[PDB]
């Protein structure tokens, strides 16, 4: 325990293994330590470390934070096998600047800390507004189809779908920089909605199961096609494909023959339960030497995040549709929802990613809250709401308290 | 001997260890100095730390 071995990082990237005194204060070692790395660099034939103007030599963690000069290496949380970085930090001292006249003073100062609008951002705003505009247009046209079977909805939406996709193609080919790509992607993605309702609205007669088969089908196809030729925005497109696919299976079954919705909902729930365990494998198979490894790593990470999101959306819709405050053993789905939530609530810890872990943890909480709301709207009476309100506030309070306390 | 003698005057315990081995001078990285060569042969000058 009298000494510790650690890796020290030096100029341009050489790592050197050294056995340091575990109890002397850190300020005592930086100078001779610098000599040793320079000696090895000089014998190795590399360029030694050098000072520049005014500054000092400091020893920091790989995060960059310097260690307190007066404390012992054992007094700090540094263990054998860790690594450190030796660095030069320049002097920041300079004269102070004053401006008397408050009008000029406020103008000069305020222009430094905040960013003004520019022509690059101006385009992304317009691009976002056009996307919002068409998703509203499809909404009113779709609402009209719900009361009328005439071709108008498909006729007018079809032309919009063609126009938005046409414009998107030119932007994609003309692109030059990351900013240009962002604008192009936002525009193309906006084409999926008008095209989707354009097909689903074509089959005559009242709306329902028969039209549903077309809608979720063309939707899944378009999302997959965009992902293939674009190869960007992986996570969101992946989510659309999953939710679209599972809905198409349910739509086709209900359209062909189904004894009850409960049967379909129960089937979907079981499919999702097994899908959670397959998700990491699916994500993993879906994916100068350094480029291949990092590309593989980030591509893989993205697919899992999207895959988890798709499953989370389906279970809450299915689960909340299965439970009921009046039908039979009212308590059976309530406790079943609890057991189903427990698995998700506990398993979230197995993944290192922050957003992946948070989405899993969040998926369980929303189901419990949603179930209570359903049981509060229907079977409405002072006892029902009084119980639900107390439950909803105590529920998360206990969860955070158990973790923080 | 003089270091242990001085340590006792400071009230600190003398240098002591157990097991097969030996006592020697080392650099900040733990590398021991050469036992058969002069400090003038090695790169040692006034104010160095060991």
């Amino acid at each position: 325990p009298q000494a510790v071995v650690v890796g020290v990082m030096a100029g341009e990237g050489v790592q050197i293994g050294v056995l340091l005194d575990a109890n002397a204060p850190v300020s005592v070692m930086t100078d001779p330590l610098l000599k040793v790395v320079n000696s090895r660099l000089r014998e190795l034939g590399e360029a030694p470390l050098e000072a520049t103007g005014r500054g000092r030599w400091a020893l920091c963690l790989v995060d960059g934070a310097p260690l307190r000069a007066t404390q012992s290496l054992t007094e700090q949380d540094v263990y054998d096998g860790d690594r450190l970085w030796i660095r030069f930090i320049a002097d920041t001292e300079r004269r102070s600047q004053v401006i008397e006249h408050i009008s000029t003073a406020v103008a000069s100062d305020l222009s430094k800390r905040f960013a003004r609008i520019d022509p690059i951002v101006a385009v992304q705003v317009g691009a976002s507004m056009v996307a919002t505009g068409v998703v509203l247009a499809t909404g009113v046209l779709g609402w009209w189809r719900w009361h009328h079977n005439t071709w108008l909805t498909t006729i007018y939406t079809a032309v919009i779908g063609v126009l938005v996709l046409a414009v998107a193609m030119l932007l994609l080919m003309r692109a030059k920089t990351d900013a240009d790509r962002r604008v192009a992607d936002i525009m193309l993605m906006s084409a999926i909605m008008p095209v989707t309702v354009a097909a689903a609205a074509a089959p005559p007669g009242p709306v329902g199961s028969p039209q549903a088969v077309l809608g979720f089908g063309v939707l899944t196809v378009a999302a997959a096609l965009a992902l293939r030729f674009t190869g960007r925005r992986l996570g969101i497109y992946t989510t659309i494909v999953i939710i679209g696919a599972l809905t198409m299976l349910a739509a086709l079954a209900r359209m062909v023959a189904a004894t009850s919705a409960v049967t379909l909902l129960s089937s979907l729930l079981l499919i999702c339960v097994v899908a959670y365990h397959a998700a990491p494998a699916l994500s993993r198979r879906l994916a100068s030497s350094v480029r291949d490894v990092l590309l593989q790593a980030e591509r893989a990470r993205s697919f899992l995040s999207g895959l988890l999101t798709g499953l989370g959306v389906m279970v809450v819709v299915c689960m909340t549709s299965l439970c009921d405050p009046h039908t039979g053993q009212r308590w059976l789905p309530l406790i079943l929802a609890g057991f189903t939530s427990g698995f998700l609530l506990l398993r979230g810890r197995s993944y290192v990613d922050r957003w992946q872990s948070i989405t899993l943890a969040g998926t369980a909480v929303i189901i419990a809250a949603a179930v209570c709301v359903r049981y509060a709207l229907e079977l409405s009476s002072p006892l029902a709401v009084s119980i639900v309100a107390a439950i909803l506030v105590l529920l998360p309070a206990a969860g955070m308290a158990a973790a923080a306390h | 001997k003089v270091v242990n003698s001085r340590l006792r005057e400071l009230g600190e315990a003398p240098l002591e260890a157990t097991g097969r081995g030996r006592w020697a001078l080392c650099l900040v990285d733990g590398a021991p100095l050469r036992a058969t060569q002069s400090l003038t042969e090695q790169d040692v000058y006034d104010g160095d730390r060991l």
Binding site: S27, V28, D31 | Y45, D46, G47, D48, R49
Partner: peptide, 18 residues
């Protein structure tokens, strides 16, 4: 400056001569 800082600087300076 502290006593430690003074001796640290003094040791660095002690290495050189005309």
């Amino acid at each position: 400056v502290s006593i430690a800082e003074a001796e640290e600087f003094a040791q660095k300076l002690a290495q050189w001569r005309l």
